[PDB]
Amino acid sequence: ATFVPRHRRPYQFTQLVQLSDGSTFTVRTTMPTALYKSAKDSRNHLLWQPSDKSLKNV
Amino acid sequence: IPDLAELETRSALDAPIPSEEDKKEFRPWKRAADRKARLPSSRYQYHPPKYNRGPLHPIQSPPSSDPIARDFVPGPFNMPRLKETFRTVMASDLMTLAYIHTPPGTPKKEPTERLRAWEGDSPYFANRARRAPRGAPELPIRERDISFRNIPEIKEITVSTFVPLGLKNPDLLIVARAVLLAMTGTMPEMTRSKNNVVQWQLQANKPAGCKTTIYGNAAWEFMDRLIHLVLPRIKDWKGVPASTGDGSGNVQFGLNPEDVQLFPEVECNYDMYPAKMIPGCHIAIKTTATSDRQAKLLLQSLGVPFYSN
Amino acid sequence: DPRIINILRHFAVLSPKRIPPPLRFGRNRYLRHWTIHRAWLLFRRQQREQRERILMQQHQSMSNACEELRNTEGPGTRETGYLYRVAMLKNGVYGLKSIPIEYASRALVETPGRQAWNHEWKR
Amino acid sequence: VIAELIKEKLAARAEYNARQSALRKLQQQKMLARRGTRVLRLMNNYSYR
Amino acid sequence: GGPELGSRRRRAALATTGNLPFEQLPYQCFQDARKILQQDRAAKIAQIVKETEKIKLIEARDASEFEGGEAAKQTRIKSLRKYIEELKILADINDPEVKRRFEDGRGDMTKPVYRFMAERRWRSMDYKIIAQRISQFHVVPDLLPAFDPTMDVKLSFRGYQVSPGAILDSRVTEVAPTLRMQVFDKGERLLTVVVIDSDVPDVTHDNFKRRCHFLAANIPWDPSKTVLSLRSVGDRVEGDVGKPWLPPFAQKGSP
Amino acid sequence: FEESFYFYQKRLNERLTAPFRKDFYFKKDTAADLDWRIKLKERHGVPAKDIGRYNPRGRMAWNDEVLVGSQTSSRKHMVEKLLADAEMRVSEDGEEIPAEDRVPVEKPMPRRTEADEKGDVKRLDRALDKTLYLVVKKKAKWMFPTGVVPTDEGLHETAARILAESAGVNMNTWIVGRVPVAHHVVRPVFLKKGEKIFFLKGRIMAGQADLTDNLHDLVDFKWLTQEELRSTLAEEYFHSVKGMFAER
RNA sequence: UGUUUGCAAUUUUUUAUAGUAUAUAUCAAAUCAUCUUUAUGCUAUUCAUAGACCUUGGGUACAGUAUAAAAAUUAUAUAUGUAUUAAUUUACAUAUAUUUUUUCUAAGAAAUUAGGUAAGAUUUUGUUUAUAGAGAAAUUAGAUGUAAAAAAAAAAUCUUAUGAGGGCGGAUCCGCUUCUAAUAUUUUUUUGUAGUUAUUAUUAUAAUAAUAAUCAUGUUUAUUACUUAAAAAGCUUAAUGGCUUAAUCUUGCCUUACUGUUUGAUUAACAACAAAUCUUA
Numbered sequence A: 001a002t003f004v005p006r007h008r009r010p011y012q013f014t015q016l017v018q019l020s021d022g023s024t025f026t027v028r029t030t031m032p033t034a035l036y037k038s039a040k041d042s043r044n045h046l047l048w049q050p051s052d053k054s055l056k057n058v
Numbered sequence B: 001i002p003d004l005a006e007l008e009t010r011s012a013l014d015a016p017i018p019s020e021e022d023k024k025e026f027r028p029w030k031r032a033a034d035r036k037a038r039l040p041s042s043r044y045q046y047h048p049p050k051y052n053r054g055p056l057h058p059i060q061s062p063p064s065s066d067p068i069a070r071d072f073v074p075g076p077f078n079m080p081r082l083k084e085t086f087r088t089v090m091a092s093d094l095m096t097l098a099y100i101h102t103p104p105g106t107p108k109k110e111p112t113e114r115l116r117a118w119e120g121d122s123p124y125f126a127n128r129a130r131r132a133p134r135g136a137p138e139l140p141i142r143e144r145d146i147s148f149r150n151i152p153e154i155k156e157i158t159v160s161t162f163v164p165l166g167l168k169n170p171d172l173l174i175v176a177r178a179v180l181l182a183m184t185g186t187m188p189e190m191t192r193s194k195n196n197v198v199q200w201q202l203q204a205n206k207p208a209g210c211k212t213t214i215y216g217n218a219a220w221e222f223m224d225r226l227i228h229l230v231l232p233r234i235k236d237w238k239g240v241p242a243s244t245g246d247g248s249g250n251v252q253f254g255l256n257p258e259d260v261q262l263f264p265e266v267e268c269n270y271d272m273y274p275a276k277m278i279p280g281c282h283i284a285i286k287t288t289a290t291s292d293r294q295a296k297l298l299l300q301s302l303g304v305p306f307y308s309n
Numbered sequence C: 001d002p003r004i005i006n007i008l009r010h011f012a013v014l015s016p017k018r019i020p021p022p023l024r025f026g027r028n029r030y031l032r033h034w035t036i037h038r039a040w041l042l043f044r045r046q047q048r049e050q051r052e053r054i055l056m057q058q059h060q061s062m063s064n065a066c067e068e069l070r071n072t073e074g075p076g077t078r079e080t081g082y083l084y085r086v087a088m089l090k091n092g093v094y095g096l097k098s099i100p101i102e103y104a105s106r107a108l109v110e111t112p113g114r115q116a117w118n119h120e121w122k123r
Numbered sequence D: 001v002i003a004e005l006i007k008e009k010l011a012a013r014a015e016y017n018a019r020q021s022a023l024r025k026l027q028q029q030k031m032l033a034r035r036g037t038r039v040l041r042l043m044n045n046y047s048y049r
Numbered sequence E: 001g002g003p004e005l006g007s008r009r010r011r012a013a014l015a016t017t018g019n020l021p022f023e024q025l026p027y028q029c030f031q032d033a034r035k036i037l038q039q040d041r042a043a044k045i046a047q048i049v050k051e052t053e054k055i056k057l058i059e060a061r062d063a064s065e066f067e068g069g070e071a072a073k074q075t076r077i078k079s080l081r082k083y084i085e086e087l088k089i090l091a092d093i094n095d096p097e098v099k100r101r102f103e104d105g106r107g108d109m110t111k112p113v114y115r116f117m118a119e120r121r122w123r124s125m126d127y128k129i130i131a132q133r134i135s136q137f138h139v140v141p142d143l144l145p146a147f148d149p150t151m152d153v154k155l156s157f158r159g160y161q162v163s164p165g166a167i168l169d170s171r172v173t174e175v176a177p178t179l180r181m182q183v184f185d186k187g188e189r190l191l192t193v194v195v196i197d198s199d200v201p202d203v204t205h206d207n208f209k210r211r212c213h214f215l216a217a218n219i220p221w222d223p224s225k226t227v228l229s230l231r232s233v234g235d236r237v238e239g240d241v242g243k244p245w246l247p248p249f250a251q252k253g254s255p
Numbered sequence F: 001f002e003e004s005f006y007f008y009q010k011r012l013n014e015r016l017t018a019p020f021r022k023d024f025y026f027k028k029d030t031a032a033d034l035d036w037r038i039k040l041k042e043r044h045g046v047p048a049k050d051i052g053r054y055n056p057r058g059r060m061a062w063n064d065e066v067l068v069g070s071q072t073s074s075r076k077h078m079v080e081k082l083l084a085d086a087e088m089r090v091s092e093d094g095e096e097i098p099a100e101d102r103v104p105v106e107k108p109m110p111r112r113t114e115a116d117e118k119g120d121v122k123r124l125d126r127a128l129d130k131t132l133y134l135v136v137k138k139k140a141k142w143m144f145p146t147g148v149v150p151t152d153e154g155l156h157e158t159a160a161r162i163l164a165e166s167a168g169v170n171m172n173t174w175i176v177g178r179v180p181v182a183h184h185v186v187r188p189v190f191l192k193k194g195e196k197i198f199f200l201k202g203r204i205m206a207g208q209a210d211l212t213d214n215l216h217d218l219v220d221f222k223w224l225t226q227e228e229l230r231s232t233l234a235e236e237y238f239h240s241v242k243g244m245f246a247e248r
Numbered sequence G: 001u002g003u004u005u006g007c008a009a010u011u012u013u014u015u016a017u018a019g020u021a022u023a024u025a026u027c028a029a030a031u032c033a034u035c036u037u038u039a040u041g042c043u044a045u046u047c048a049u050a051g052a053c054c055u056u057g058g059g060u061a062c063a064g065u066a067u068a069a070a071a072a073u074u075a076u077a078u079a080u081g082u083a084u085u086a087a088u089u090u091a092c093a094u095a096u097a098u099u100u101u102u103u104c105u106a107a108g109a110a111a112u113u114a115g116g117u118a119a120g121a122u123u124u125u126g127u128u129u130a131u132a133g134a135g136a137a138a139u140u141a142g143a144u145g146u147a148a149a150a151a152a153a154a155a156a157u158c159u160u161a162u163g164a165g166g167g168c169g170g171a172u173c174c175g176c177u178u179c180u181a182a183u184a185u186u187u188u189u190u191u192g193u194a195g196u197u198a199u200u201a202u203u204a205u206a207a208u209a210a211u212a213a214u215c216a217u218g219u220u221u222a223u224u225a226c227u228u229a230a231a232a233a234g235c236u237u238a239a240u241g242g243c244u245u246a247a248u249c250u251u252g253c254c255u256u257a258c259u260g261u262u263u264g265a266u267u268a269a270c271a272a273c274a275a276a277u278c279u280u281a
Ligand SMILES: NC(=O)c1ccc[n+]([C@@H]2O[C@H](COP(=O)([O-])OP(=O)(O)OC[C@H]3O[C@@H](n4cnc5c(N)ncnc54)[C@H](O)[C@@H]3O)[C@@H](O)[C@H]2O)c1
Pocket: B075, B076, B078, B079, B080, B216, B217, C044, C048, C052, F002, G216, G218, G220
C-alpha cells in the first residue's frame, strides 16, 4: 500500500515586474507585492552590458 | 461518403456557440438561492483512495491529471518569459551555431559495446565475464549532437542548504526551511548528515539541512529571477566558474547568505527572520544537455556570464 | 521565539492535515474540465508541431546550403570543399565568449521600455 | 417538485432505518437465546457439564 | 419526473434549472476550449476526405506503374486505410457528449468511436483479471498453447454475476449460465461456445481427462449484442447445439 | 483560450493551495498592514488581485467559473488591477489618503510604438512582436547585403566585411557562426557566369544601418517583416531564403 | 438529504416496477472527513434625530464585469460609560479571561524494531565529475545503451503434443511410426519497409521519385519494455555460500513466533544410541 502524497504549496500571487529599462512582465511568486520595481538588474549592469557607455565610468 | 457516415452525428463540437439572450438568463448564483433546498446527491460517489494497493485491487487511483485526484496540481498560470525567449530566438541560434553536416547517404553509426567481451581461440575466453569499463569504473554518457531534434533545455533546479550548526541551535533549521520555501514556492524536504567528524562537531543521521526541486515553468521562472534580479545585485560578482559541470550536462554553483537575501521573496520579509540566520544555498541547474560544453553553451544563451577558474 | 513561532505557523497551514482537500466535481463540472484539459493538450500539440516544423525547415535550409557548398570549386583556385571545410570548424563555439551577452541577456517582455531601441548606438 | 423527491429521499431512508432497527431487534434476540442456552452433556463418570 | 428520466439528482436538477444543451453552457473557458476542438474536428474531417480520394487514385492506378507491383500497391492502401481509421476516432475522441453517451451505456456500438472506448475500458481492469486467471489456473498450456483474449465474457448463474475463477455450489450451476459478451471489432460473425471440464479424474490410468459440458456453434453476434442465454441457443437464438448443458459436478475427495 | 485557461487555472489554485498568511509579510498595525487590510476588504477577502472575487470555501465554492464575455480573465483587466493595487493607500502616519490625493503608478508602455503608427520601415522599434529583416536596394533590386568571396577570406569573414561595407559599423551585430542558413543559385547562360550565394545569419542588438559612403552601389534600406519580404523580394530570391525564417 | 449543487460517469448487493433471463430506478457497503446558516450579519448611500461636530436608528441597493445581500458567523464570568424598559432585560462599548468552530507552535522536522501476508521500488557500497561557507575529511546534484505503425510467404533440420482418441504389433501403457500443429534453429529463397510532416527535382494545388524526421490524443518531471562487467552495500553477530526476477528496502493490515496427531528423508544425521535438522498430510 504505497501512499499517494499530496502537494503542499503556499499561496502564490501574480506579480508585475518592472525592470530598470521601464519594461514590464508578469511572474508568479509567493510575495504579496503587486508591482516589483527593479532599480538594479541585468539591463543596468556592466557585466551584462559591456558595450553600454552610460554605465562605463573610467 | 461512407467513412463520414461512421462518425458520430450528434456532434457537440459542431454546435453553435451560446446565445446572448440565453446567456443573460444563465445565473448560477440565482439557481442556488431561488432553489430554497439542497439538490439530491448523485449516486456516483467514487473518491480516489489514500493508498495504491496494486494494479488488480478493485479500487484504482486515477492519473494525476484528473482534477479529483490527490496528486492534482493546477496547470500553467502564465508563460515564463525565458522559455518563450529560448524557444523563439535562441533555439535556432544554437542549432545554427552548433551544426555539423552529414552527407545524404551516410550510413548510420553502429554503437560498440562498452563492456567488452573476450574474443579469441583460447578455450578460457568463452565463458569469461565481460570486461570492466575502460578507464573510469563507471561509464560516462556519450554526447548527443545539437540538432533540430535535440535542443538542450532546462529541466529542473535543486536548491539545497547545509546547516551543521543547526544541531546546536535548532532555530537555524526552521529559518533555513522558510527561506527555501519563499525562494522557490515549494515545501523543502529536510536532509540529514551522513558522516561523523569530531573536529567539526558533525554527528551522523541528524537533520542538518533541506532541499527543494522545481520543475517545468517554475524552473524557468526561478532562472529569470536569478539571472536578471539576483546575480546583477551581488557586489563584485565575476560570474559562474568555468569549472562547473559534472560531465553530463548539469551546472552547479553556490550562493552566500548575503546573496540569498537579495531574492525579492526573501528581502520583502527580511525582518521576520532572526538575525544571522538566513543561510546560503547550492543551486544545481539540470539541463537536457549531454556534456559540460553543451550546458555552458546553453546558459550563455540565457544571459549567464562565466569566468575562467 | 515570537519570530520563530511565526515561521512554525507558516509550516502548520502547509500540513497534510490542514491543506485543502482534493476537489469534488459533479458530472457536468467534471465534463467541462475534461473538455478544457482535452483542448489544452491539443493546443500544446499544435504549438509543438508548429514549433518543430519550423526547426526542421531551418535545418533543411542549412543542409541544402552546406550540401551545395560541399560541391563548390572556388573561390578561384581553392579546391572543392574548401569553403565547406572552413564552415564546419567550431573555433570559439564552445568557449566563454561564444554568444554575446548583450544578445542573450535581452529576454522578451510583455511591454517595451521607455526606449525600445537605441538607434544612436556608436561603435 | 423538489419537495416530493426529497420526501421520497427521506422516506427511503426513514424506511430503511425502520427495517434496519427491526433487523437489529431480531439479531439481539437471537444472540440473547444463543448465549443463554446451556447444553450439559454426559462426559464421564456419569457427570454432566 | 419519472424514473425514465434518470436519477433523483437529474429529475431534481431537470426541474430547478434551464433547458439548455450541455455544449451551450455559457462558460468562458468551456467555450474557448470547445472552439479549439471544433476547429480541430473540421481539420480531421477534411483529412479523411483527402486520404479517401487519395485511395481512389491509387486503386485506379495499375500495378504495372508501381515499382514493387501489386505487393507495393496493397501495402500502400493498407497504410492509408489504417490512417483513415485513426482519424475517424480522433474526430470524436474529444467530444464531451460522446464520452457521456458511452459512460451511460447509450453508445452506438456500430461506430468505431464507442467500440474504441469500450475496449479501452475493458483493457483497464477486466482484461488484466482474465489474463491473470488464465495463467494462474494453467488454462495455458493445458487447454491452449497460447491465449490472448480479445473480447469480454461475463457469465452469470440465475442472475448472479460470478467472478472469474470462483467456486460455485453445485445447486447454483445446475442450470445453464448466461453470457454477457462484448466484441470490439466491426461486423457480424458466428461464434462457438464450449464449456470444458479439465480436471476429470480417471482412476483407471491415474490421470485426468477432459469432458465437454456444453457445445454450440453458428451463434451470430455483432458488437451491438450484449446477452446470450445458453438455454435458448436452439429455439430463440440461431445456433446448433451439439451438446446441451451438463450440470458440473465433482466427486468427493478430488481437487 | 490561453487567457481563459490561465484564469481558469488560477482559481483551481485558489481551492487547493494553502491560505495566505499576512502575518508572515506584514507586522501588525503598521503602514503596510493597514494598507493591505484596506485593499483586501475591497477585494472581499481574496488576497489575489487577478482572479476577481471567489471564495474557495463556503456554500458557493462550486461556482468558480466565469461566463462568456468576462472581462475578468482578460490580460488588460488584471494589469489594471495589479496597478490599482500598487499605489500606496495609507500614509506612513497610518491614516487613509483621500480618494483624490492618491498617486497613480506609472503605467506600462504600449506595445505598438510610434513607428507602428506612422509606418516607418527604416525604424527598428517597429513591429516589436516580429522579426525584422534588413533588405537593401542596389542601383534596382531589393536584396540582402552580398559580395563576392575573395580567395583570401571565407564565408563568415566575407559576410562580416560586406555588412560593414554596406551598412556601416554603427550596428552591434553578431554573425551566428560560419554555417550558411540558406543559399541561392543562378544557373549560367551558356555566355554569362552563374552565381552561388550563401547567406549567413546575423543578429543586431543595437544601432542602425547607414548607407553613406558604402562601397557597394546601395541606395536605400529598410527593415521588413516576413510577410513584407514576400512582396518586396523576387519570387525566386524569396523562395530560397524563406526556409530560414522563424515563427515570428 | 454526507458527498459540491446543470442532469442516468466506479465496484458488488438489497428492494420495486416492467418483462421472460434481461432493462431502469432504488438501497446498502467499499473508496473519501468538501468546508454547505439562502441570511439573521457586514458594506455604501439617504432621512429622521441634536445643533457645532451625537446616540439610537427607519428606507434605499435588484446582483455574470455576479452582488451590500457572508473571506468564514459559537458561548460564558467579572467591572465599567451610554441608553433602556416595570430589570445588571436589552444593545452598545471596551478590559480581564474561559470557550466550540481542529483552523495557524513544522512529526510529510524525531525513533536505524528485525516476524506473517500483500503491493510497490530494484546498485543502494565504493570509485568518480562538479558544487557558498568547505580544508585530506561535512552537504547536494549527476555518471550505459536501445526499442515502441505494420508484416507476408516457401522449404528443410530436429525437438515436443492429454493433436488427428492416426496406422502396424505387443484411444490411454510400450516399440515402430506417416500427417498436422507449436517453440527453437538457417547467413536460409524471398516479398514488403508504408502513412504523416517537411525538403529537393520533375510534371500539370495535385501526382511521381529521392532525402530527412517520426513511441506519443498525451497535465515532458512523459511513459513503457529491455539492457547497464565484477566487487561492494543490505540481509541479528565471524567466515563461507546464496538473494537483486527477492531472502534487501518502503508502506498497509496483522501475530501461524498457532493446538493435537502425522508422512517422507538427511544415499538409514553425527561411520552407534540419544539430544537434533529439513519436510508432508
Ligand atoms: N509533451 C508531450 O505530450 C509530447 C508529445 C510528443 C513529443 N514530445 C517531445 O517532448 C519535447 C517537448 O515537450 P512538450 O512539447 O510537451 O513541451 P511543453 O513546453 O509544451 O510542455 C512542458 C511544459 O510547458 C507548459 N506549457 C506548454 N505550453 C504552454 C503555454 N502556451 N503557456 C504556458 N505553459 C505552457 C506545459 O503545460 C508543461 O508544463 C520535444 O522533444 C517534443 O517532441 C512531447
